[PDB]
């Protein structure tokens, strides 16, 4: 790596299924209109509530990936 | 939303199950007194450990709810 | 200063005209059934969006009062 | 929200008539091309100066809206 | 602890004699009116001052306390 | 800017009308004795009170200014 | 406690199956070498991907002990 | 500057030589797109290593720019 | 106080007795020559060690005073 | 120094006789161990309540020391 | 040390040249004026674009010296 | 990785040649007597000066590796 650059991105994942989920669940939303997706990095766990259950689960992270052609 | 106000306490969720777990039932109790319950925002992940196993996870969080009141 | 022992809480007011709208109106209906409030310290800025315009925005502060000691 | 998968982007909106000026042209700009805005975040308040006069107040706002799902 | 939850308060202590005395008693302040604490976390360490001594020292901390009952 | 060397000080303006006011106050005050201010940067939003109502905001911010270099 | 003395040691959990399994399978390990850990601390959440997928999660936490004898 | 608008993005510049060069290589790829670098700011200095030699440099960087079209 | 301006110094206060007299000997001097001490704020708590001896406690402070001139 | 190296660990110091003593008693024991330890730096101040009283301050600080020879 | 205290300054370096050169520029600007400094700590690495080269490297960074007399 | 787990210490990179040096120099000791190493990240960047120019820089910097075999 001399000239290997990379873009972050910032995404808030959600699902009422917990943080793993969420992270999962945002994830696939990015790599499926973005290019090889490199790394996360969750930046907070927030969350809303309805009856007093988590309504859904809020995972905002930073995903990595590469840029190329040339 | 016209001009209401909340109110942000913090609780101390704790499970063996994980963070999930830990999370749901931290907020059940704050829920069980408070005043609808609109959102939540973990702080910190840490947990008690006995020897090769967790004993408890501990999820701080801020729960914040409404305040609005006259 | 000796005795004073004060108690610091964390309030949310909301407004759609602006920061000190916001901070005036949480402080104000703080008070509107709390103590004396000392200080107030700026947590946070966000807001909630319909289309280009806030349409309030959200000040979290720290807010703390002295409590009673005889 | 369980498909909701939102993308926080940044940006700095200036004025020189304050912040809430500064936060509002932001946000406008930003939406008159793009989508819909759903919350912002105050990242920071700063300023550029001629004597001891601000020619323009600089606020960095993280925004983020809702991607698309099917 | 699968269903302990905490309380976590914020109390500011002070006291001419130093950072020890002033954590010392506000604390005595929170336990005299609440339920059995069972921890604190410093914040800050601030001060004021008279003839150029500290007229008196001010430990933010945060206090933790167990709920229970059924 | 090669031989730029510029020093950041830091200042805490006040006003009863605002955060734009305290700023401005502070900022003002600051060059009127003082160099060519460059930049501010605000570090605290916070403020003193009476009853509900703000006597006065505090924004302090660290501003900076050129040096001399020849 | 009363003049015990605690290392605070740093280890990184990785799993392919979400946060929980990460934070317990890096303490295992810990655990399998070191005197009975006391207490974990999470500082991180990352994750690398070698497609669209979560390859494995990797939860960075701080781990204290004791050490004390004669 | 009357009320101009700018955009903030992420990039990760690497280079075996060194910090400079991983800056400098990362602000390289950011501009050959973009729209005249306005300023950066280093958020942290990463490094992979292979051995007992840094194998690349890794600078994650914030670059902003224009956007006050219209 | 109707809209005075503060002025905001870093010292480092320094003793072998402790945290207090660090900084109640480095509010000394910053006192010995301004202009009236307000209030002061800790940064940090550090300190020079020989080999099993605190040689020396250095608390660095930030010290607030007037600067409402005219 | 100039071609110096140091390791830094990380040490919890507790003490029933406040922050002081914690520090004092805790580097105590590194050096019990350790090479003669050069700096250390507080990272907290907490502490358990058994009850209204302080039962042990608890004093995180990170100690750092040299390392060469040959 | 027992009544020794520092003064903490904060100054911008920059350069064309990179981090260490801005570093080192800045700094002998203070030496310059200034009393003997001691040390200095980073606070930031920005700086400033032209045809999309760092025009100018700017480390801002914090120094501190002793004052003395009597 | 699977199932892997790390270990993060702290160094110190000192030298006379400004941050990439110090940085190269501090891992190269790392390395010296660890398996080897994986990765860095950058804490922060000080240095102490006995005089106008810098003595040498500090690096201190998180490594991590890797431990696994049985
Ligand atoms: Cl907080
Ligand atoms: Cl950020
Ligand atoms: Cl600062
Ligand atoms: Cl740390
Ligand atoms: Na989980
Ligand atoms: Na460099
Ligand atoms: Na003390």
């Given at each position: 790596?001399?000239?290997?650059?990379?873009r972050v991105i910032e995404i808030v994942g959600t699902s009422p299924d917990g943080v793993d989920a969420?992270?999962?669940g945002g994830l696939?939303?990015?790599?499926?209109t973005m290019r090889a997706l490199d790394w996360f990095e969750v930046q907070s766990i927030r969350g809303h509530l309805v009856d007093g259950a988590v309504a859904h689960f809020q995972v905002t992270m930073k995903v990595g990936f590469?840029?190329?052609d040339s």
């Open positions: 790596m001399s000239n290997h650059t990379y969420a992270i999962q696939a939303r990015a790599a499926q590469r840029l190329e």
